[PDB]
Amino acid sequence: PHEVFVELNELLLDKNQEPQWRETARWIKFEEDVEEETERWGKPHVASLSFRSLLELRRTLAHGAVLLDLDQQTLPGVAHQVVEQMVISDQIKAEDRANVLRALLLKHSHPSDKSKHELKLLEKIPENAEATVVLVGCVEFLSRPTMAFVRLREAVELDAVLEVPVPVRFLFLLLGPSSANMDYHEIGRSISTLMSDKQFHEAAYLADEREDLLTAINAFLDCSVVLPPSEVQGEELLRSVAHFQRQMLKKREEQGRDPLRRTGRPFGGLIRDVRRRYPHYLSDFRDALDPQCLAAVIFIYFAALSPAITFGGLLGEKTQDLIGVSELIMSTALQGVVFCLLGAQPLLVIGFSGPLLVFEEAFFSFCSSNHLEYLVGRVWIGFWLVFLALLMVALEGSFLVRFVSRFTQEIFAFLISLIFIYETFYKLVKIFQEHPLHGCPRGQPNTALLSLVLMAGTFFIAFFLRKFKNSRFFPGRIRRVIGDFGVPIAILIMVLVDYSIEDTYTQKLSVPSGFSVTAPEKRGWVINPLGEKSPFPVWMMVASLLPAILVFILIFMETQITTLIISKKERMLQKGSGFHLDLLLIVAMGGICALFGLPWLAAATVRSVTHANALTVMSKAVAPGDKPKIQEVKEQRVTGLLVALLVGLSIVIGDLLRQIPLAVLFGIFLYMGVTSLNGIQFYERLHLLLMPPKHHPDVTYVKKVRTLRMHLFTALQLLCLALLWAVMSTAASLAFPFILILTVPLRMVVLTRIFTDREMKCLDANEAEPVFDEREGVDEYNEMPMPV
Amino acid sequence: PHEVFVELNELLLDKNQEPQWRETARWIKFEEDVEEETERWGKPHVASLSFRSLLELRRTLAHGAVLLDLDQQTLPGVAHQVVEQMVISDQIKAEDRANVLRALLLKHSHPSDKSKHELKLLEKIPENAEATVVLVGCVEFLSRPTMAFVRLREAVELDAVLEVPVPVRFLFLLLGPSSANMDYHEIGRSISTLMSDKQFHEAAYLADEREDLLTAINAFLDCSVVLPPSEVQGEELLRSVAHFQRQMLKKREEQGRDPLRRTGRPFGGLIRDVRRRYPHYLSDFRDALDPQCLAAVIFIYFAALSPAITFGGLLGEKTQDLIGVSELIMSTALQGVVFCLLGAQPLLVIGFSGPLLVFEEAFFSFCSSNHLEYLVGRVWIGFWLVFLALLMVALEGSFLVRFVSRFTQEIFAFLISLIFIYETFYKLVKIFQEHPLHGCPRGQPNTALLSLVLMAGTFFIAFFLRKFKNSRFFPGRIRRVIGDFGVPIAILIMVLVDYSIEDTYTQKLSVPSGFSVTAPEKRGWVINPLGEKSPFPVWMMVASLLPAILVFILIFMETQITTLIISKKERMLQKGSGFHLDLLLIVAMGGICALFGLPWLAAATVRSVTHANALTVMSKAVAPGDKPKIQEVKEQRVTGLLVALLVGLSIVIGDLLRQIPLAVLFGIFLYMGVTSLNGIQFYERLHLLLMPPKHHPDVTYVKKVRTLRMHLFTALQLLCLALLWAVMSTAASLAFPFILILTVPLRMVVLTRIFTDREMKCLDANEAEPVFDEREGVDEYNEMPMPV
Ligand SMILES: CC(C)CCC[C@@H](C)[C@H]1CC[C@H]2[C@@H]3CC=C4C[C@@H](OC(=O)CCC(=O)O)CC[C@]4(C)[C@H]3CC[C@]12C
Ligand SMILES: CC(C)CCC[C@H](C)[C@H]1CC[C@H]2[C@@H]3CC=C4C[C@@H](OC(=O)CCC(=O)O)CC[C@]4(C)[C@H]3CC[C@]12C
């Protein structure tokens, strides 16, 4: 029951008319061929063998000779008995035992002639494999085609017939005249393909007579897919063959033969998730003495720093510099270090996200209308956030995440992706109104156009760099560690270009001097929970619970959707998850930090996935032509600590971060908003609405359902999204999480009556397939339908 | 020997337990299947049938019933004789003769209900094509599978068994118990696949016994491709299956068994070419009473007007407005009408090209350093151009274009594409030089940035519109009628945007009032050949012959390559073309027209291709899943006349063409320069220089030759091109056609010394395949490896 490595040699004349047995083909899992003109290995492909060759092979084995359990060690030894019983049993007479043996004892030459190629090829083969050599050639001095099949009792390594030092178990030799109308190369290919299949060598092991070999051939024949003699003209061999083979194999085989579990005990989830990860604590600070962690932490720093200033500049601009970029950087370091040192899932990198920014900008306007302080409302919301977190954990309410399906996960992403574009365009339109474009700090000549030029330049540089990265010019291993390295290059290029111009004016960032708040005139370091400049109304210390529920829903969804995808069965995450502990450590820490005037934090979905797949290592011992598979993921909690410490220390360069114009940030904002739309199964279903049915794709949600019903589903999704967007534009904009949570009952009740269970299974398919920066045009953005 | 259309019915129970023989599959050339859940036709695919079904079919054909040469015209009668010979031939014993007859005379239900679907289907089916039906079913009261095969003596329609009104010749029916472990649907598919092959029905027509049918099956089996029972990954089939199929077919087939010619008569080319096109003169003006021509005229007018102003603007700008856009517009119409009235190939759209502009630019600087006059030099060059034209045709030599291969046909295009980009970037640098970007005609504030914005916007709009046009959102018939329709929209958008902003200054086109020269202060309407202001030197009377030779080489190459490519064999261009009446007409007209201070004209190869493939109509009677083929090309000489007349009359819109900013023209210039690089074989070979060999494509010039050899070929091309670029930048810039005519012998001599005859058949591949706006990302720019 071993693995078989097959090699097909041939007897072809050299440049100096030397017989010189030469290697022709090599089978491990799929066939590889050698071209005569370029003498290099080709790409692997499925071995498509003819039928007359199979018929000829079955016919000629009737008169062949078999040597089962042969006790020799060397090729000269085995050849003597082979030719002896060859002559004994009819084929080739006694007047030929001088030249047939001459052909067997010859020199074998390979094209790639402790080395490099040999070591690589041996690595490709499984560790414990047996080898087989098939020798076919045309000989002029024979009469009829003769065959000999042998099986050595003990696996013995030969001298030079093979390509790598692997012992042989079978040897198949075929010699015959060229007068007979037979293709010997095709017969050799057919017998190699037969020997390279499981059910044939598994019977050759147990074979003891020609009858067993004939039965094995017959049983192999009645499992194949015969193609007609019709010329193929393109993609015809993609609809039938694969699905037909899979269906036939399934039919032949069929007829042939929980962390999210309620326990009824208060605070049981915390105990269950702390009794697993913490025992393996010393294994988290010692399994990171490898170069891959050092390589990763360099590029994770940029990926964690770029959103820190992009989301901080807008927050500082909108809130009149009440919460600027300094607080966002300082808040990430304090919570990140605590989460890395004390958390259960250290692969999560926490940071400010999109929906939190939208909620903050919606809440800021609500306080301004009612003439209330903004910092104290946040701290009073923060206190109620801890109570809900403790209540939810004690009752083990984290199992509700199973009820959030793909129907809700994409409307949210589409909304958050439209918000960014609207914000960017509105900001541009406003800049074009502050400074009119008339002739010869308002009323400046070249501020209206310079901002547009910078925004377009940074957006297009980032877009084209992203397009270039996902191409054939980058190897898979270098494409996986590099976590979207286009933004740090576009920002640097635009800053360098803007630095050269020293005559015009443009708005810059608001980084302060030293360790101090961005606006050391309106607030201090601690926020008084009773009132800073005027008493806080007593009636909103109990009425602030309502926004607390909405922000808790947002944080809970954003944190629990990410953790499910990170910890799957396809990814080799072995130690343990943190479903219950992570929520507590993320909601309590943010509620505490809300006192010192710092924003809340979330799971940082895309950054989390990039960090998750930047530490993985892929298997190297895989057969060529097969899809790559994951081997193991390095689990440690020292790279997150280093990233958090570097982000925190990145505040000491405030003399450099002050030179960044406030237009490159909006260009990056628009770029992220545009690129977040990839991977959601709503955008392409909307694209399909503008195509003829003949051009529709071959995805799983078009073949199994009718077109009109799919269009109806898309129309319902559009109606829900439009209703929610219309609600958001009003003065009750502080309610959209409630509408987002009022769409799960709409799917469990209303949407179940219209559609059949089959269409719900086909369309609402929350299954997902992991990506590892393979193929073309697929990156970490395609993994999750959740926005950035 | 006719075509056969077969359909596979299958007895499947209805909703209310009704037998209702139902249609399951339909073969014309490739199989089409009906989906069970959505009951709609799927995409065509190759019929990949199993092997056990074939074996069972061969086994059960041994004791079947063959009603050869039946003489009935109704289904009840043929069913009566079928059941009669079944009960006679020991298939149904004694008690089942009416229940079986009950199943045969039932109602057939097709999944498609003077109509629409069958009118559409009748076109795809060949004209004199016979039809046949195969009926299979899993019934209980048989106790043993029974078969009947018939051949009606005369083709007779059989009411509603078929979905289209086409007579039937055969009908194959199979009934058997479900307790037999036979997949009846698979057997029906297999028998349909055999019946759809030429060598099987061509032997069933003249068969006389079941032995002939068995022999036909056996001969069909020994032509197929057997696939092993191994899972496919999607790409493993493309490498093997098609090539193996082709080689096996070639082996089986083997086992089974000038307009360019000098005569010796002076002016013989004109005599030979007049007697072919002029007899078919009245048909030219009568084969144009079709609705295609209106859309052709309008879209070709839009596609031919844009190059007139784009090339006219730069020529007017950088020649001190000696010749501008008005002269270019008047020159195109004056010669276009003459060529469309007296020409031999009226599909050529003559107009100003790139290389002519480059040569004019180089020549203008040469006359500004020797203190000569630019206009009179041109007219003295023009006189020598006619003499060379008359000498080159009387001594017939319009055959050296066969010696201009693809080696020297791509350096030219890449050179032009680099020249365009360099020109645009130099213009941008200069326009920034005149207007500095400091704070608060020269020195204007907003001219430096507005020009950049206008240049970038139009280029990006055109690029993205071209990318969108070649997607799957557009059908194959609307994509051919419209040419490059992104420029006429980008120009309009960027003119409308600039029109609103009226607070600043920017350079605009210089269009004069009425029919007058663009500079009515330094030149008139007729150029004096002896001198306008100062006497012209006499030593330039004969020293002007060399530039005449150079421009003659340029014009000859540009016209002859286009003439060769258009008049191919794949394109069904009837009547005849002319290689001798075109060159003489074009060169003589240009030489005479240079007297009045107007530029020369060329073939305008991309416009010629767009004109050629906009009048073509593709056949509709083609089997689904096959490559489209050309029915005919409408040949007429009234659309070119209309286009030329419209272009000429477009001069009265001088009050609107004066509002176009000059930066949009440079944006379009850069767009054309960038987009002209598609299709040249040198560019992808340059791309391959920076890619690992494992990711190399499967094109014909990588498999058959080694990597280092193609790298050396590309290095030699780069060396020659760099030498030509270096010599083009000196004070002798008007000598690069000499460099090209020198590098032509270089290919032959050196590359046959070095690279051997085998590789100089795939590296220097002049084959080229026609494009008809099919596939994805392929347009008229890929057809022609020449500049715009
Ligand atoms: C790209 C976006 C921003 C454009 C605006 C939204 C559309 C995609 C909306 C516009 C009107 C909608 C349509 C209105 C009516 C219908 C009926 C729906 O089917 C039925 O109502 C009954 C048919 C059945 O049940 O099978 C088919 C979808 C469709 C075309 C809807 C699909 C979604 C549409 C096209
Ligand atoms: C726009 C850029 C890409 C221009 C420059 C392209 C590459 C930098 C060029 C520079 C010089 C070139 C090289 C010049 C000489 C050779 C010989 C070629 O070798 C042979 O094939 C000789 C041996 C043989 O007989 O096969 C090896 C490629 C190489 C290094 C060439 C590969 C391409 C190179 C490195």
Examine the domain organization and report whether A182 and A91 are in the same domain.
yes
Approach to solving: cryo-EM
User: How would you label B51-62 residue by residue, b for 16+ Cβ within 10 Å and e otherwise?
Assistant: bbbbebbeebbe
Q: Which burial class, exposed, middle or buried, applies to B380 when counting CB atoms under 10 A from its CB (0-12, 13-18, 19+)?
A: buried
Task: Give a yes or no: residue B84 inside a domain.
Answer: yes
Residue B548 lies in a domain: yes
Residues B248 and B308 in one domain: no
Residue numbers in A near B42 (CB within 8 A): 239, 703
Residue A39 φ/ψ region, left for φ over 0, alpha for ψ in the -120 to 50 degree band, beta for the rest: left
Query: Ligand 1 pocket: which of A718, A720, A721, A755 to mutate (most atoms <8 Å of CB)?
Result: A718
Answer whether A577's CB lies under 8 Å from A345's CB: yes
Q: What's the half-sphere exposure (Cβ side, CA atoms, 13 Å) at B772?
A: 17
How many C-beta atoms lie closer than 10 Å to residue B162's C-beta? 21
Q: Which one, of A487, A70, A543, A546, lies nearest residue A310 by Cα? A: A487
Is A230 part of any domain?
no
Domain containing A220 equals 3-225+244-251
Q: Is the dihedral of CA A472, A474, A477, A481 positive or negative?
A: negative
Query: Is B240–A54 a contact, with Cβ atoms under 8 angstroms apart?
Result: no
**C-alpha distances in angstroms, B232 versus A48, A220, A571?**
12, 17, 24
In a domain, A533, yes or no: yes
For residues A697 and A548, membership in a common domain is answered with: no
Closest atom of ligand 2 to B690 CA is 3
Q: Answer yes or no: do A45 and B239 touch at CB < 8 A.
A: yes
Q: Domain for residue A263, yes or no?
A: no
Return the ligand number nearest the Cα of B706.
2
How far apart are the C-alpha atoms of A556 and A587, rounded to whole Å? 9
Contacts of B229 (CB under 8 A, 6+ apart): A197, A220, A223, A224, A225, A245, A249
Residue among B701, B660, B665, B658 nearest B683 (CA): B701
- Partners of B690 on chain A (C-beta within 8 Å) are 473
Contact flag A50-B227 (C-beta cutoff 8 Å): no
Enter the tokens of residue A221.
Answer: 């024949």
The total domain count for chain B is 2
Same domain flag for A276 and A396: yes
Task: Say whether B72 sits in a helix, a strand or coil.
Answer: coil
Q: Are A727 and A769 within one domain? A: no
> Do you know the residue count of chain B?
788
User: Is the Cα torsion angle A453, A455, A460, A465 positive or negative in sign?
Assistant: positive
Structure-token pair, residue B220: 């069909």
A603 contact partners, CB below 8 Å, separation of at least 6:
A348, A350, A353, A558, A559, A561, A562, A563, A586
What number of C-beta contacts closer than 8 Å exist between A and B?
A: 226
The C-alpha angle with vertex B745 and arms to B739 and B748, in degrees rounded to 5, equals: 140
- Residue B707 CA to ligand 2 center (angstroms) comes to 11
**Gap from CA of A200 to ligand 2 centroid (Å):** 49
Residue A536 carries which DSSP code? P
Q: Is the dihedral of CA B177, B180, B185, B190 positive or negative?
A: negative
The phi-psi region of residue B182 (left if phi > 0; otherwise alpha if psi is between -120 and 50; otherwise beta) is: beta
CA distance A655 to B357: 52
Clarify whether residues B459 and B316 are in a common domain. Answer: yes
- The reply to whether A216 and A147 lie within a common domain is yes
Assess whether B218 and B329 both reside in one domain.
Answer: no
Half-sphere exposure at residue A502, Cβ-oriented, CA atoms within 13 angstroms:
2
Question: Which ligand minimizes its atom distance to the CA of A716?
Answer: 1
CB B508 within 8 A of CB B661: yes
Q: Do B205 and B125 lie in a common domain?
A: yes
Residues A341 and A373 in one domain: yes
Closest CB to A38: pick one of B30, B44, B705.
B705
Q: How far apart are the first and last CA of chain B?
A: 50
Mutation for A interface: B225, B503, B708, most A CBs within 10 A = B225
* Residues A227, B225: C-beta atoms closer than 8 Å: yes
- The H-or-E segment that residue B133 falls in is strand B129-138
**Are B192 and B6 spatial neighbours (Cβ–Cβ below 8 Å)?**
yes
CA distance B425 to chain A (A): 16
Which residue has the CA at smallest separation from atom 35 of ligand 1? A715
Whether residue A259 lies inside any domain: the answer is: no
- Give the whole-angstrom CA distance, residue B384 versus residue A400: 90
Structure tokens belonging to residue A700: 């799983």
Contact by Cβ (8 Å): A594, A291: no
Pocket test for ligand 1, best of A706, A708, A714, A716 (most atoms within 8 A of CB): A708
β-strand partners of B661? B508
Of A240, A238, A37, A227, nearest to B245 by C-alpha is A227
Ligand in closest contact with the CA of A759: 1
- CB B712 near ligand 2, within 6 Å: yes
CB contact under 8 A, A703 and B55: no
CATH of the domain at A204: 3.40.930.10
Same-domain status, B560 and B624:
yes
3-state secondary structure of B495: helix
Residues in chain A: 788
What span, in angstroms and rounded, lies between the C-alpha atoms of A371 and A413? 33
Residue B226, ligand 2, Cβ within 6 A: no
> Is the separation of the CB atoms in A34 and A627 below 8 Å?
no
* Ligand 2 site-directed mutation target among B688, B689, B751, B763, most atoms within 8 Å of CB: B689
Residue B265 lies in a domain: no
Torsion angle, alpha carbons of B574, B580, B582, B584, to 10: -170
Residues B421 and B553 occupy one common structural domain:
yes
Q: Name the strands in the sheet holding B168-176, side by side, starting at the edge strand that comes first in the sequence.
A: B31-33, B22-27, B3-11, B129-138, B168-176, B146-156, B65-70
Q: What does B182-201 look like in DSSP terms, one character per residue? A: --HHHHHHHHHHHHTSHHHH
Ligand 1 contacts (CB < 6 A) are A 686, 689, 708-709, 711-712, 714-715, 718
DSSP string across B613-655? HHSEEE-S---TTS---EEEE---SSHHHHHHHHHHHGGGGHH
Contacts 24+ apart (CB under 8 A), B389-392: B389/B552, B389/B583, B389/B584, B389/B587, B389/B588, B389/B591, B390/B584, B392/B552, B392/B556, B392/B583
With respect to residue B274, please indicate whether it lies within any of the assigned structural domains: no
